[PDB]
Amino acid sequence: SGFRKMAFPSGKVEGCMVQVTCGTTTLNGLWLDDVVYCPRHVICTSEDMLNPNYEDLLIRKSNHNFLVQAGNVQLRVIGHSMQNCVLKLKVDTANPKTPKYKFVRIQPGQTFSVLACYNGSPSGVYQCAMRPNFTIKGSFLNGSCGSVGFNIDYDCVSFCYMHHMELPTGVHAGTDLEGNFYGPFVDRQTAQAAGTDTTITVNVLAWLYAAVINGDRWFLNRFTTTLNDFNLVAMKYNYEPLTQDHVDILGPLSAQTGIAVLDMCASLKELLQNGMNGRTILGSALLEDEFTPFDVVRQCSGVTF
Numbered sequence: 465s466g467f468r469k470m471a472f473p474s475g476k477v478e479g480c481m482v483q484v485t486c487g488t489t490t491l492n493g494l495w496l497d498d499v500v501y502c503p504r505h506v507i508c509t510s511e512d513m514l515n516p517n518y519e520d521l522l523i524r525k526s527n528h529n530f531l532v533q534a535g536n537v538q539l540r541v542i543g544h545s546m547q548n549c550v551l552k553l554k555v556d557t558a559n560p561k562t563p564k565y566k567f568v569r570i571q572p573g574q575t576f577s578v579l580a581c582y583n584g585s586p587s588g589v590y591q592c593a594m595r596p597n598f599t600i601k602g603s604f605l606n607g608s609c610g611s612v613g614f615n616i617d618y619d620c621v622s623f624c625y626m627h628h629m630e631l632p633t634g635v636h637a638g639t640d641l642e643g644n645f646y647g648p649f650v651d652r653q654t655a656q657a658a659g660t661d662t663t664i665t666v667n668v669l670a671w672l673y674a675a676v677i678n679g680d681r682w683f684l685n686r687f688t689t690t691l692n693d694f695n696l697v698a699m700k701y702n703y704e705p706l707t708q709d710h711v712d713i714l715g716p717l718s719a720q721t722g723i724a725v726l727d728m729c730a731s732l733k734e735l736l737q738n739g740m741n742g743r744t745i746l747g748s749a750l751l752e753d754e755f756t757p758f759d760v761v762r763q764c765s766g767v768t769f
């Protein structure tokens with residue numbers, strides 16, 4: 465039994481993090497095959513970060529102005545392009561540790577493991593979620609730029625996130641590996657406000673389902689509710705509106721626990737209206753929304769990659 469916030473084994477991604485240096489700036493890069501991906505803000509000075517013209521800055525930069533180092537090995541850059549907000553550096557050697565990879569753009573509410581790095585070496589790995597405002601609440605210090613988020617499909621590492629900037633609010637924003645920012649965020653040191661962050665209701669229901677599987681059953685009520693009426697309560701407490709698609713995704717969990725979705729949604733309504741009265745669910749005095757329904761069935765059924 466037991467239920468903890470798990471992250472995918474970072475081994476396959478460790479053999480792909482390299483160090484990227486342009487002038488004075490040094491951040492982490494992703495070396496897949498013969499290409500190195502890194503945030504394009506590596507090409508700016510400290511003054512340019514206010515209003516940077518990246519296309520003009522890249523024009524002045526040649527191949528010999530970029531330094532790629534995988535551990536203690538300098539890779540010779542042969543071509544530099546700029547796909548959206550990602551700098552693509554064509555190196556000479558194909559990474560012999562490139563796994564079966566795939567570039568995906570995750571939807572809000574999905575979770576992914578982050579391998580935080582500095583100067584090309586991994587420091588730690590944690591599991592975070594894509595907030596509905598297209599931000600993430602992670603731990604990144606200076607030099608963490610270029611740290612990648614990923615999911616592992618048994619053998620295929622699905623790269624989905626690359627850290628770019630910490631918003632002044634303390635949250636973090638990034639792009640997919642194609643360069644497109646997750647959200648309305650541009651790469652410049654300017655007052656950028658995120659949207660209103662809701663609570664992933666479907667993920668909370670999966671977390672409540674995980675609690676029933678792992679012992680905790682105090683929140684289970686004798687009541688039930690309908691979909692629209694529960695959404696009227698979810699709107700009050702800034703919770704994501706629930707759809708029939710979410711009910712069917714929670715289908716596998718509902719069958720294993722013998723508790724219908726609308727009956728679990730009723731137990732959630734009481735927790736939103738009456739609080740928790742100082743109790744705890746799976747060691748948490750607050751409702752958790754960083755576990756997708758697929759993350760629960762991974763830990764509650766047992767699969768390996």
Ligand SMILES: O=C1C[C@@H](C(=O)Nc2ccc(I)cc2)c2ccccc2N1
Pocket residue numbers: 505513603604605606607608609628629630636651652653
């Ligand atoms: O998450 C982080 C990562 C790191 C950072 O990304 N800097 C940054 C770089 C380019 C732009 I354009 C905008 C921002 C950082 C440096 C110093 C203090 C806190 C943080 N927090």
